[PDB]
Amino acid sequence: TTYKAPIERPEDFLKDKEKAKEWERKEAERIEQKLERSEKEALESYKKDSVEISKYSQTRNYFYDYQIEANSREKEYKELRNAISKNKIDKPMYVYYFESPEKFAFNKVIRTENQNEISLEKFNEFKETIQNKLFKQDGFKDISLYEPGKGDEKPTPLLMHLKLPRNTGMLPYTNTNNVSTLIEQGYSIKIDKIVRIVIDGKHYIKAEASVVSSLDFKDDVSKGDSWGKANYNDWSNKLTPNELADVNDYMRGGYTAINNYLISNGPVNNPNPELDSKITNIENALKREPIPTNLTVYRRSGPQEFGLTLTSPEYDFNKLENIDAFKSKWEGQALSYPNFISTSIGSVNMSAFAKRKIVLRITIPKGSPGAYLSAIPGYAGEYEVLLNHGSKFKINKIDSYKDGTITKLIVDATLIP
Ligand SMILES: S=C(NCc1ccco1)Nc1ccccc1Cl
Ligand SMILES: [Zn+2]
Numbered sequence: 001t002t003y004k005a006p007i008e009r010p011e012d013f014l015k016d017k018e019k020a021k022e023w024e025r026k027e028a029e030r031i032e033q034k035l036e037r038s039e040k041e042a043l044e045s046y047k048k049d050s051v052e053i054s055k056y057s058q059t060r061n062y063f064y065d066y067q068i069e070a071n072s073r074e075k076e077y078k079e080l081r082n083a084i085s086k087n088k089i090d091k092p093m094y095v096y097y098f099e100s101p102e103k104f105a106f107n108k109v110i111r112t113e114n115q116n117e118i119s120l121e122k123f124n125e126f127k128e129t130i131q132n133k134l135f136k137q138d139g140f141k142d143i144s145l146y147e148p149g150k151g152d153e154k155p156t157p158l159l160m161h162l163k164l165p166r167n168t169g170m171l172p173y174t175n176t177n178n179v180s181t182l183i184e185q186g187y188s189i190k191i192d193k194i195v196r197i198v199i200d201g202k203h204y205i206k207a208e209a210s211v212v213s214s215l216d217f218k219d220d221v222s223k224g225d226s227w228g229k230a231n232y233n234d235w236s237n238k239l240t241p242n243e244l245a246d247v248n249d250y251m252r253g254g255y256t257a258i259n260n261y262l263i264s265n266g267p268v269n270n271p272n273p274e275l276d277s278k279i280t281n282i283e284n285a286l287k288r289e290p291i292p293t294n295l296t297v298y299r300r301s302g303p304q305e306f307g308l309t310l311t312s313p314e315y316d317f318n319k320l321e322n323i324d325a326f327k328s329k330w331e332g333q334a335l336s337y338p339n340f341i342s343t344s345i346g347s348v349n350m351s352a353f354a355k356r357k358i359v360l361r362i363t364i365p366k367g368s369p370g371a372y373l374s375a376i377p378g379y380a381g382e383y384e385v386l387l388n389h390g391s392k393f394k395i396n397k398i399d400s401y402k403d404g405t406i407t408k409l410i411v412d413a414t415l416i417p
């Protein structure tokens with residue numbers, strides 16, 4: 001039943017640097033024979049501009065489809081992405097890399113770079129920050145295949161020991177006299193265990209991390225639409241006529257009256273049985289065929305969703321103090337929506353919400369209520385997934401990016417069951 005690999009390796013090289021580097025060099029030479037000339041050229045460009053190429057691969061998919069196509073960095077992105085995808089690994093591989101604790105919204109400082117010790121207080125604070133959370137990792141990154149020792153670069157107090165699952169793209173390559181391994185990331189990680197370790201008198205937190213598989217179509221709306229239609233083409237027929245009629249009414253513009261009623265706390269202030277009945281039916285419809293796999297969706301959120309307005313000075317994310325204030329208020333916090341929440345399987349910008357500065361990137365766990373409404377023909381919504389009213393979201397991490405000269409935010413959140 002097991003595939004025999006061309007160059008044998010264990011799942012983890014552990015502290016064995018010599019054996020890891022030997023394997024990595026042999027793999028780099030082996031995979032080089034599978035690469036196309038345009039793929040080899042993309043790898044050469046990568047070594048001369050890795051920082052900018054990596055930053056581009058993190059946020060390229062948030063633009064309009066025509067902007068992605070027109071971007072001068074897109075050709076290089078596609079070629080380097082294809083190169084890594086030429087070596088999907090046959091069995092899991094544990095990798096190692098140093099990470100900033102800020103990557104997990106930990107701002108209390110594990111220890112300063114010049115400091116040695118890690119207090120029990122900071123270790124416990126870090127544990128409570130990362131426990132029971134998923135964190136999206138995205139973009140090109142170089143990783144190591146063995147545990148660092150004395151002679152190795154250790155730029156932070158946090159060491160990631162991450163299990164890459166089978167079929168993850170991994171590209172070992174040569175760079176002048178050295179060898180490195182490139183991955184594209186693009187998955188959720190969970191930190192299962194943290195331990196204090198000592199390397200040459202200095203203390204580090206070693207984080208045992210694993211990938212929690214999910215669908216994330218990003219700018220590939222065609223692939224997302226195929227998945228949505230494969231799972232929800234027969235959804236309309238699973239509903240009662242009243243449920244289907246209320247879902248249809250909502251989709252055709254009834255969402256304004258229903259959601260305004262929910263936002264205004266209408267069930268408490270002025271109960272409307274006709275609106276309550278529609279809400280009941282739509283909620284039931286969303287529970288008929290739960291989201292069948294962990295799924296990432298994207299919502300271009302209005303400032304009112306985060307207690308701001310279009311003219312609020314706090315909504316100007318071009319100022320670093322406004323980003324820091326937003327992160328302080330929302331990172332690690334829960335956000336509950338009284339209304340139904342429309343999202344898209346695509347991360348691309350859309351003309352209807354062109355100027356919205358907040359991109360809510362939601363991971364929906366398997367079994368959540370929801371439905372791919374765009375499986376119903378002739379609908380305005382773009383590749384739409386509707387989430388149930390009253391949904392709660394845990395905000396895990398917030399990032400920023402530039403959309404032209406306007407700074408926008410990416411809010412990495414998880415739907416709570
Ligand atoms: S940050 C880091 N590894 C990640 C990496 C590979 C290339 C560039 O950055 N340090 C390290 C060095 C040697 C062995 C193991 C580790 Cl974790
Ligand atoms: Zn010590």
Ligand SMILES: [Zn+2]
Pocket residue numbers: 279389390
């Ligand atoms: Zn309700």
